[PDB]
Amino acid sequence: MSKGPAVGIDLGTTYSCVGVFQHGKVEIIANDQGNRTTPSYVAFTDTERLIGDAAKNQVAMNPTNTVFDAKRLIGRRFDDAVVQSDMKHWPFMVVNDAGRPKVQVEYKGETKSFYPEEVSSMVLTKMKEIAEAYLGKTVTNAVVTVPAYFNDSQRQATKDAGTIAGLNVLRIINEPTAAAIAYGLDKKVGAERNVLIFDLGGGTFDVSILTIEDGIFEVKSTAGDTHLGGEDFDNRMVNHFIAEFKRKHKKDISENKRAVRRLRTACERAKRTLSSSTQASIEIDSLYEGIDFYTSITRARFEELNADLFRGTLDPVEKALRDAKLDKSQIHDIVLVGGSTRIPKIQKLLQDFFNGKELNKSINPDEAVAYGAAVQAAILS
Amino acid sequence: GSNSPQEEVELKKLKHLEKSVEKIADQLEELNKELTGIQQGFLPKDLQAEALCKLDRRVKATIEQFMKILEEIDTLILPENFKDSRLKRKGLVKKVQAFLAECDTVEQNICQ
């Protein structure tokens, strides 16, 4: 194959995304399974190594050997408070190798350990291959995104993942800087601009404030919740339904893992529908003890169940404004990133906070970081 | 009668899921044939346990495929007037659940 262009890669916690700027526009690249985003998952079986969709699809069958969340470990010391707290919730083993964390799994019958950058290099290799398959050309150059709060070690470990994957890392850029680039906030004429990025998706919540003067970016503050995302909104919905099935049929489905999974999956789908509709219907045949579960949820019911979590998204915004020494009136632009920003209430809450100021939401929230990185990749090539 | 063209779309979705369930049921049948094979075969009692346990990944993959079928059936919204689609969906769910119960039987008698 001939030489290809430079790509933008958003190396996410749960999902990664690759984009290419060509023909004067960004094209998000769909993978082999036709998905625009790919799970940041690596699975080790008795016969092979699986990446992305294939690794995520067999997680129920091989939980201890299916690695995800490597971004949460990348560039960190084993004894880091974050490593120790996250370890409890992972099905896979995390071991200490001379102060460094390593994921421990069984690969082809043997016990093997991998550094977080080696796992992230497998995910980047897949993103490199996703781009090569679409373009029909060899892809080497890329811009890789990292969160604004990443330290020297976390940023180097990400650049190392790129190197291991056979990538030439043009630049490592902040995820909120990438989202600002996507909206051309660095091209607007005028005085310096204060930008607030509201990133709610991929299991993390990140609020960043940036200042842009003559195309120069400065991170003024970063705030958020490490473990807040869409899954938390799903749990509330599931709890509501379990409570409902108890009220209606006087039966507890919660100790049946298959009933709870069927209900959870239906809730994730109903949540998505409620972002564009005011009501979502669910029909689950023989959910538990032969009982058919035909129900519905209104957008107002979903908002109520999640009222505290949704409201709580503004605390990080206030904390970021305090740290950046800025008043909410000093923010020129607000940018929505992450799938959970599609939730109409979150949008209403945030716009009301900024006294009716319009939000930058036209680019898919999931693809906005990869969009900016793809633009940057084109600029640097 | 009152049969609608719209329902033909839903019955076609159900017919594909029925064919998919048949494909997984054949995997469960091959596992059953294999499981009996190790049990009634030439392997010594010790070697049998290890061989039966090697079928764990496959039983688990069979269970997972059925679960994914269930999750796809659960995405259907069939109005009250689509009587034939509601019957096909219910019959298919019950069919999958009975196969799932067979899978649990396999799973409980291997890797012990």
Ligand SMILES: O=c1[nH]cnc2c1oc1ccccc12
């Ligand atoms: O992650 C999401 N949260 C809430 N609504 C949606 C999310 O992804 C979507 C994709 C399409 C439509 C709605 C949503």
